[PDB]
């Protein structure tokens, strides 16, 4: 559950990285002198690698979603266990109130 969702979070961050690499590459090209042309090539390869693996991750996840889609609303649930747990907790609360009353009558008896 955290796996595919964390993949989606990573692809969010890498879309940001793609835009920042676009911006950094045209930043270096706008310079009056741009000595680090090797670093320009590195930023260009970084940009294209970012776009390519963003495409790879999203295509893979659309494929995986195509494999496990059904168009049906999933008739499973967990309601009955929550109901039984609520009844158990209210049993405990009822016993707590009754124990408070018995202890209060014991304090009234011992108090005199």
């Amino acid at each position: 559950l955290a796996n595919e969702r964390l993949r989606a979070l990573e692809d969010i961050e890498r879309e940001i990285g793609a835009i920042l690499q676009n911006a950094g590459t045209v930043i270096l090209e706008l310079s009056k002198e741009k000595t680090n042309e090797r670093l320009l090539d590195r930023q260009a390869a970084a940009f294209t690698a970012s776009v390519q693996h963003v495409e790879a991750e999203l295509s893979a996840q659309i494929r995986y979603l195509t494999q496990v889609a059904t168009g049906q609303p999933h008739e499973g649930s967990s309601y009955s266990s929550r109901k039984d747990c609520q009844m158990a907790l209210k049993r405990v609360d009822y016993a707590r109130l009754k124990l408070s009353d018995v202890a209060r009558t014991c304090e009234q008896m011992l108090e005199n």
């Binding site: 559950l1 595919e4 969702r5 989606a8 692809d11 969010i12 879309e15 940001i16 793609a18 835009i19 676009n22 045209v26 090209e29 940009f47 776009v51 963003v54 495409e55 999203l58 295509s59 996840q61 659309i62 979603l65 195509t66 496990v68 889609a69 059904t70 168009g71 609303p73 999933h74 499973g76 649930s77 967990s78 266990s81 929550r82 039984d84 747990c85 158990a88 907790l89 049993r91 405990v92 016993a95």
Partner: protein
């Protein structure tokens, strides 16, 4: 249908990647300096400035659309990826069963201790002389 929605997601992804690549390549191509002929330096330069700004805006818009696609895919996964619903349901069920069993063990032990105290109190009260 589900197939139709998945196709539409595929179409959006292909379109966004294509648009980012095309806009960046076109900006790089315009960035070429060429010799002028019948273009009047000043007009050519303003037109080029407008083109670059519009293409950068288009790249940012494509990034926003990719964010929208990621959000829609996340919603689809949270709503109808059957395996994870089953593991969530099973984990919830097992946790609630353990809480119920703890409550019932506490109550049963409480009943036994209270019963022993009740036996002592019954003996004392009924055998009181008064």
């Amino acid at each position: 249908s589900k197939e139709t929605l998945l196709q539409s997601y595929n179409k959006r992804l292909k379109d966004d990647i294509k648009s980012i690549m095309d806009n960046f390549t076109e900006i790089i191509k315009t960035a070429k300096i060429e010799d002028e002929t019948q273009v009047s330096r000043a007009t050519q330069g303003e037109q080029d400035n407008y083109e670059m700004h519009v293409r950068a805006a288009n790249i940012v818009r494509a990034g926003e659309s990719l964010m929208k696609l990621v959000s829609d895919l996340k919603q689809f996964l949270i709503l109808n990826d059957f395996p994870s619903v089953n593991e969530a349901i099973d984990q919830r069920n097992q946790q609630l069963r353990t809480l119920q069993e703890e409550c019932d063990r506490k109550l049963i032990t409480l009943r036994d201790e209270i019963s022993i105290d009740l036996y002592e109190l019954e003996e004392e009260y009924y055998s009181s002389s008064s």
